[PDB]
Design a binder for this molecule. Structure first.
Ligand SMILES: Cc1cc2nc3c(=O)[nH]c(=O)nc-3n(C[C@H](O)[C@H](O)[C@H](O)COP(=O)(O)O)c2cc1C
Ligand SMILES: Cc1cc2nc3c(=O)[nH]c(=O)nc-3n(C[C@H](O)[C@H](O)[C@H](O)COP(=O)(O)O)c2cc1C
Lengths: 107, 118
């Protein structure tokens, strides 16, 4: 599974871990993207309503599941089957999120 | 590796196989025994519904069911019970894992026992 971990205890939820498969999928290196928000995957044709749904989920520490258009480092458009799942502490605070990505195949 | 990232987060989790009838647990992390009192011998190959009991909110359970059945994500809090009967609040996520055709093939469930000071 390709995935990233973002730290919700830091402003704007920066990536703190990218799996080897994220690099394989997107072309971006772990040194290019750690410390950054995952929004860099979006581009001209990404559905902004779907982005707004993710933003709401993230802001409220709840789970997102959906499909959105993203772009690789080289500009290649792909369909990303995405989940973003809050990780909570024992007080119910959202401390991290895990985002899991699947590139929809051509067939 | 996903398992490792999770362990770095000290996160209790299970994985269920949506390709098998009734979505059985195929893997449970060591924290799942610690939290629930159930061994992997008691839990692997079963559905996680065994953690529910008399006062579990059946309307919340229904929301989980409807997410699982439709390959979507659940997030919520419900009353669960340890092997010894102890009730606990379980802050639960259930997240579909999909193949490259959009088929839900597994789920990952992440549990947090709510602290006594909350
Ligand atoms: C852990 C995690 C993983 C994410 N992965 C993606 C991604 O794969 N693709 C994407 O377009 N957005 C992804 N996002 C969503 C963006 O980072 C951001 O939350 C979204 O663009 C909405 O907020 P904004 O409108 O302020 O950008 C992810 C978010 C989190 C927290
Ligand atoms: C991966 C995964 C983890 C789950 N973890 C829990 C859990 O920790 N506690 C719980 O009560 N139910 C858990 N469930 C939900 C139940 O297994 C079941 O889906 C739910 O009770 C609704 O279906 P049912 O009405 O047929 O029982 C989990 C389900 C999945 C797929």
């Amino acid at each position: 599974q390709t995935f990233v971990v973002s730290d919700a205890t830091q402003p704007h939820c920066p990536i703190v871990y990218a799996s080897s498969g994220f690099f394989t999928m997107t072309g971006y290196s772990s040194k290019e993207i750690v410390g950054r928000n995952c929004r860099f995957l979006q581009g001209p044709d990404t559905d902004k309503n779907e982005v707004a749904k993710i933003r709401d989920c993230v802001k409220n520490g709840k789970s997102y599941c959906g499909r959105l258009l993203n772009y690789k480092k080289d500009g290649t458009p792909f369909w990303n089957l995405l989940t973003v799942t809050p990780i909570k502490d024992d007080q119910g605070n959202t401390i991290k999120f895990i985002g899991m990505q699947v590139e929809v195949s051509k067939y």
